[PDB]
Design a protein around this ligand. Structure first.
Ligand SMILES: COC(=O)[C@H](O)[C@@](C)(O)[C@@]12O[C@]13c1cc(O)c4c(c1N[C@H]2C#C/C=C\C#C[C@H]3O)C(=O)c1c(ccc(O)c1O)C4=O
Ligand SMILES: COC(=O)[C@H](O)[C@@](C)(O)[C@@]12O[C@]13c1cc(O)c4c(c1N[C@H]2C#C/C=C\C#C[C@H]3O)C(=O)c1c(ccc(O)c1O)C4=O
Lengths: 121, 121
């Protein structure tokens, strides 16, 4: 019986990392956990405050070109307010629409990776 | 401040969903959270028991070809016992090795997506 407790982190492919940083931290409001050298380049690691699973903003996997990532869904406690905030902050939002699984919206980062919001029922 | 609490889920590109599911559920030991019809096909969702962030094994994003995903790291309380459990079930493992950020190991799913394991020091 495996001792795996959770996903520590996964990777999002970006091109300009400084730009991605400011987007995920200032615009989307993630916490900046680490920004330092890593083995294949600059390790840039972000997460919603207090979450167990963080995201790494990388540029070193050929198999994941910048902006390729889809099907990422972020849980929020208030999808209307978050959409209002994003729009305020100069991001294009698609939604919020209702769905069988909660109230949802979509937007994209500066490379074109597509991020969902979901507030469950 | 944004009302985003955590990443609800993210996507892992696969070809055969029935193989993938058996791999993640039987080999890697995840719980099966859903196996049901979705928008763009079959919705198949796996997570470590207890965990906030879950994984969807999808086939339908052209920008994420099967087996293309990298830089996924799973947190575990016993990487040594995990690597030996994986090995006895037919999985080629690279590790464990000590790194600055914990004891770490690596393996691929049937499609070639590279999963990491990490037990912190
Ligand atoms: C082909 O797969 C790989 O290159 C690796 O085997 C990985 C993906 O698995 C990997 O070893 C990598 C790796 C590189 C890093 O620079 C770091 C890390 C690292 N672990 C694996 C993970 C990953 C996500 C993108 C990557 C890269 C590898 O270069 C870290 O884990 C790490 C780091 C910093 C603070 C942490 O708390 C931490 O956990 C960190 O800088
Ligand atoms: C069509 O919209 C999109 O392209 C977007 O990618 C999302 C983010 O909006 C996406 O709409 C998708 C989507 C399809 C689904 O079939 C589901 C869902 C779904 N939401 C978004 C999510 C995603 C990850 C891969 C996908 C694709 C879209 O088809 C769900 O969110 C969902 C589902 C089942 C139980 C849940 O608790 C749940 O949250 C579920 O079946």
């Amino acid at each position: 019986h495996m001792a795996i407790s959770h996903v520590q982190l996964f990777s999002v492919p970006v091109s300009d990392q400084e730009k991605a940083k400011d987007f995920y931290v200032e615009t989307v409001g993630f916490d900046l956990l680490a920004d330092q050298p890593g083995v294949h380049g600059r390790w840039l690691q972000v997460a919603p405050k207090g979450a167990d699973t963080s995201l790494v903003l990388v540029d070193w996997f050929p198999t994941m070109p910048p902006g390729s990532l889809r099907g990422l869904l972020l849980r929020t406690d208030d999808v209307d307010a978050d959409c209002a905030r994003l729009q305020e902050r100069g991001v294009a939002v698609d939604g919020p629409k209702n769905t069988p699984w909660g109230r949802q919206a979509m937007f994209s980062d500066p490379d074109g990776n597509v991020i969902g919001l979901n507030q469950p029922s």
